[PDB]
Structures are given as C-alpha cells and as structure tokens.
Amino acid sequence: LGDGFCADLLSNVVVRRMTFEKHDTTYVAPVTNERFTELPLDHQLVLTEQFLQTTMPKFSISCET
Amino acid sequence: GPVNARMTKFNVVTEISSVLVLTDQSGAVTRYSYCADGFVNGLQCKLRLFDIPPGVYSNSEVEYP
Numbered sequence: 057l058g059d060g061f062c063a064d065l066l067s068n069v070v071v072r073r074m075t076f077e078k079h080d081t082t083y084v085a086p087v088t089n090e091r092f093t094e095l096p097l098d099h100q101l102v103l104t105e106q107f108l109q110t111t112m113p114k115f116s117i118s119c120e121t
Numbered sequence: 122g123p124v125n126a127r128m129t130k131f132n133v134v135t136e137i138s139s140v141l142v143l144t145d146q147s148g149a150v151t152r153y154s155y156c157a158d159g160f161v162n163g164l165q166c167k168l169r170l171f172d173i174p175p176g177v178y179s180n181s182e183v184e185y186p
C-alpha cells in the first residue's frame with residue numbers, strides 16, 4: 057500500500073505492516089584481547105539471482121516515410 | 122522550330138524528379154545527378170554524397186503504387 061503497509065487479502069481485508077529479513081556481514085572485527093565471540097555452527101547455501109538489461113535492437117528510421 | 126544550317130531542342134516533362142546538386146563558393150550548381158537514373162543514383166541521394174565510400178548502408182526503400 058505504500059509507507060511500509062501491506063494489504064492481506066486472503067480471508068478478509070486487513071492492513072498489516074511490512075518487514076524485511078535481517079542480514080549479517082562478512083567483516084570480522086579483530087580479536088585484540090580475551091573476550092566472548094559468536095561463531096557459527098553451520099551454514100546455509102543460498103542462491104540469489106540478479107537481472108541486468110544489457111541490450112536493445114537497433115533502429116533505422118526513414119522519417120519522411 | 123525552323124531548321125538552320127541546327128534546331129532548338131525540346132523536352133516535355135511528364136513527372137516530378139529529385140536531383141542531388143553540388144554548389145560552388147558563389148552558390149551556383151556545378152554538379153548534379155538525378156535520383157532515379159539508376160540504382161547507385163538513389164543511394165547517392167539517400168546519403169547526400171556523390172562519391173560513396175565503401176560501407177553498409179541501411180533502409181533503402183521501394184515505392185509501390
């Protein structure tokens with residue numbers, strides 16, 4: 057609907073909020089003293105697709121025609 | 122026309138023509154070529170060139186009644 061709102065049209069008409077899934081980063085801050093750190097136990101393999109337009113046809117125009 | 126010695130020559134025009142022309146410094150035409158006297162003449166008028174360098178020249182069109 058705009059402004060972070062969404063319309064749920066499954067059972068009856070409801071207006072909810074949108075959220076987004078939170079991601080992480082690959083930069084690890086350096087360990088300079090003894091402390092706690094949070095290491096992963098396992099990983100999920102993920103495929104992400106990305107489309108980018110590169111081409112068009114050319115045109116020749118006879119504007120008198 | 123009275124024959125002398127020759128005679129005044131005559132040409133009845135039947136249709137409208139296109140002609141490519143080259144002018145000199147003073148604006149007087151010093152070189153022409155009719156656009157329908159041949160195949161190369163039509164390409165000369167399409168490109169506005171008398172001496173056509175080699176290339177690929179697109180979208181020449183055929184007229185139909």
Ligand SMILES: *[C@@H]1O[C@H](CO)[C@@H](O)[C@H](O)[C@H]1NC(C)=O
Nearest residue numbers: 143144145146147148149151
């Ligand atoms: C164009 O006119 C100039 C003088 O204005 C003279 O050099 C010559 O008649 C023409 N030159 C070319 C390159 O067409």
